[PDB]
A paper describes a structure:
The non-receptor protein tyrosine phosphatase (PTP) SHP2 encoded by the PTPN11 gene is a critical regulator in a number of cellular signalling processes and pathways, including the MAPK and the immune-inhibitory programmed cell death PD-L1/PD-1 pathway. The structure of SHP2 consists of three domains: the Src homology (SH) regions, one catalytic PTP domain (residues 247–517), and one C-terminal tail with tyrosyl phosphorylation sites (Y542 and Y580) as well as a proline-rich motif. The SH regions denoted as N-SH2 (residues 6–104) and C-SH2 (residues 112–216) are recognition elements to bind the phosphorylated tyrosine protein sequences. X-ray structures demonstrate that the basal state SHP2 adopts an auto-inhibited conformation, of which the “backside loop” of the N-SH2 domain intramolecularly interacts with the catalytic surface of the PTP domain at the N-SH2: PTP interface to block access of the substrate to the catalytic site.
In this study, we designed and characterised a SHP2 allosteric inhibitor, 2-((3R,4R)-4-amino-3-methyl-2-oxa-8-azaspiro[4.5]decan-8-yl)-5–(2,3-dichlorophenyl)-3-methylpyrrolo[2,1-f]triazin-4(3H)-one (PB17-026-01). Of these compounds, the compound PB17-026-01 showed the highest inhibitory activity with a IC50 value of 38.9 nM, which is better than SHP099. The crystal structure solved at 2.20 Å resolution provides detailed information about the interaction mode between SHP2 and PB17-026-01. The crystal belongs to the orthorhombic space group P212121 with the unit cell dimensions of a = 55.69 Å, b = 91.39 Å, and c = 212.98 Å. The electron density clearly reveals that PB17-026-01 perfectly adheres to the central tunnel region (estimated volume = 464 Å3) and interacts with all three domains of SHP2, locking the enzyme in an auto-inhibited, inactive conformation. At the tunnel interface, PB17-026-01 is hydrogen-bonded with Nε of R111 in the N-SH2 domain, main chain carboxyl O of F113 in the C-SH2 domain, Oβ of T253 in the PTP domain, main chain carboxyl O of T108 and E110, respectively. In addition, the dichlorophenyl moiety of PB17-026-01 occupies an extensive hydrophobic area of the pharmacophore by interacting with L254, Q257, P491, and Q495 in the PTP domain. Compared with SHP099, PB17-026-01 lacks the hydrogen bond with E250 but forms hydrogen bond with T253; meanwhile it is hydrogen-bonded with Nε instead of Nη of R111. The interaction between the N-SH2 domain and the PTP domain remains in resting state with unchanged relative position of each domain. To study the structure–activity relationship, we compared co-crystal structures of SHP2 bound with PB17-026-01 and its analogue compound PB17-036-01, which is ∼20-fold less active than PB17-026-01, revealing that both of the compounds are bound to SHP2 in the allosteric binding pocket and PB17-026-01 forms more polar contacts with its terminal group.
Numbering used by the authors: 4 to 34, 37, 39 to 84, 87 to 88, 96 to 155, 162 to 235, 245 to 293, 302 to 312, ...
């Protein structure tokens, strides 16, 4: 994902494409959640705007995508003008192993307290300015050790004192991950995993929120984004001709290996397993019956709607339930709206779902429709937390209840935010504040089951704020 330049300006982008790029070279850069796709063509540099308010990436005049990597992969194969040569960035800021300003004793303390065999980091050198240090832990009292390797910078190239000279710290790390250094007496300096400094004890959430607010939220979030290229899983079923009109957006698709299979078998939906979840899109008129088939088949008893039916005049979640006290059939599924109850932040609809001709199949489905999410993110997490707390208790009170359905819009943004908050709060509810939480890792685990779960930095920070607020109360 080297084609994304985090700290690049617009003038710097045009200069990079014109001096170190050729026609068809491209890069992406932040703006502000506005983004810019700068492409070189016919000796010129055209700029294309990409907007993400929290639901999806919207390319001006293009299509809508779940991740910039999926956007770039799409146009490097299909419709825009020409994306041929990604211009790679040498900035290590977004790497999981780069820590820039970091003391050598603090780095030894980190690797000792939180590291394992093969855990490593790269930092700016304590003494010799402009150089870097690669600190790596190895071993299984005295059974393990921390080894430091000086990384010199000479003529914009990097080396470990001998051998190849690398154009960037990343090339050096990748090289020495595949060909690890061997010490004199046999010790192999294997670079297995970056040091996990994002996993924190739950009681220390407020301290970390203070550090990240000094921002640090941005640096951690774009480090999470840099790894999305590892989540380009297969999405073939949602591209077949018969399933194109079942997707709200043609290029926001469910991963084949986690999608819900209807027993046609397609719906834009994925099972999220950390209580499990079904993350899906807002209904279309032609998928309402498939939605209810899914709810019935998976034995789901709770539904979370993340958006209003309409926001800013645009349909975000098509109505798929009957009016209060009414009864309606959706294909072979029959649904009665038994009762609606109005809270401040949401509406609760008690629905009874059954298959036609089989009254024995009847079950109650509790529909929780959140309605006070702004047209960015909420400034107070209390409403969302109280909402999820009630949702969790309803789910826990129903024996053998299936996965919780969370949906609306494209089903990746607010949907991923609610689900990740619910996963994290679930750990603290059962195990108290004396437990480990890891917000980036939890999101990456969920993004490997549906594309682009959690869309924006504002949602990423809101997840932290929600977890902090829950732990305080
Ligand atoms: C400003 C410095 O540069 C960035 C910086 C590097 C260290 N760091 C960090 N950020 N981060 C974001 C997501 C993930 C992640 C975790 C588990 C699995 C996967 Cl797949 C991922 Cl992507 C990680 C991660 O592991 N670390 C260690 C904090 C931010 C700063 N020191």
């Amino acid at each position: 994902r080297r084609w994304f330049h985090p700290n690049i300006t617009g003038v710097e982008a045009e200069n990079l494409l014109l001096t170190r790029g050729v026609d068809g070279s491209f890069l992406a850069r932040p703006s502000n959640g506005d983004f810019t796709l700068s492409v070189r063509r016919n000796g010129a540099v055209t700029h294309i705007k990409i907007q993400n308010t929290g639901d999806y990436y919207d390319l001006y005049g293009g299509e809508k995508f779940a991740t910039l990597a999926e956007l770039v992969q799409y146009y490097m194969e299909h419709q825009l003008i020409e994306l041929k040569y990604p211009l790679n960035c040498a900035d290590p800021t977004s790497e999981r192993w780069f820590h820039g300003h970091l003391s050598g004793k603090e780095a030894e303390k980190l690797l000792t307290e939180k590291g394992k065999h093969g855990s490593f980091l790269v930092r700016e050198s304590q003494s010799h300015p402009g150089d870097f240090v690669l600190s790596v832990r190895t071993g299984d009292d005295g059974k393990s050790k921390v080894t430091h390797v000086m990384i010199r910078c000479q003529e914009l190239k990097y080396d470990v004192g001998g051998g190849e000279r690398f154009d960037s710290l990343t090339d050096l790390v990748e090289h020495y991950k595949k060909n690890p250094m061997v010490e004199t007496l046999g010790t192999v300096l294997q670079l297995k995993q970056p040091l996990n400094t994002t996993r924190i004890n739950a009681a220390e959430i407020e301290s970390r929120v203070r550090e990240l607010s000094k921002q640090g939220f941005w640096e951690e979030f774009e480090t999470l984004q840099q790894q999305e290229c590892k989540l380009l899983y297969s999405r073939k079923e949602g591209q077949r001709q018969e399933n194109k009109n079942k997707n709200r957006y043609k290029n926001i698709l469910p991963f084949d290996h986690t999608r819900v299979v209807l027993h046609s078998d397609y719906i834009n939906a994925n099972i999220i397993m950390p209580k499990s979840y079904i993350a899906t899109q807002g209904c279309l008129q032609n998928t309402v019956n498939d939605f209810w088939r899914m709810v019935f088949q998976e034995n789901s008893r709770v539904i979370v709607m993340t958006t209003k039916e309409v926001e800013r005049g645009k349909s975000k979640c098509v109505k798929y339930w009957p009016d209060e006290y009414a009864l309606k059939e959706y294909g072979v599924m029959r649904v009665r709206n038994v009762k609606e109850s109005a809270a401040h932040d949401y509406t609760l609809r008690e629905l009874k779902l059954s298959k036609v001709g089989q009254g024995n199949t009847e079950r109650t489905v509790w529909q929780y429709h959140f309605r006070t999410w702004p047209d960015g993110v909420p400034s107070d997490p209390g409403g969302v937390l109280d909402f999820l707390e009630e949702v969790h208790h309803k789910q826990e009170s129903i024996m053998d209840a299936g996965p919780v359905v969370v949906h609306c819009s494209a089903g990746i943004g607010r949907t991923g935010t609610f689900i990740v908050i619910d996963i994290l709060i679930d750990i603290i509810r059962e195990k108290g504040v004396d437990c480990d939480i890891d917000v980036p890792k939890t999101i990456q685990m969920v993004r490997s089951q549906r594309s682009g779960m959690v869309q924006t930095e504002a949602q990423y920070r809101f997840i932290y704020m929600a977890v902090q607020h829950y732990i305080e109360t």
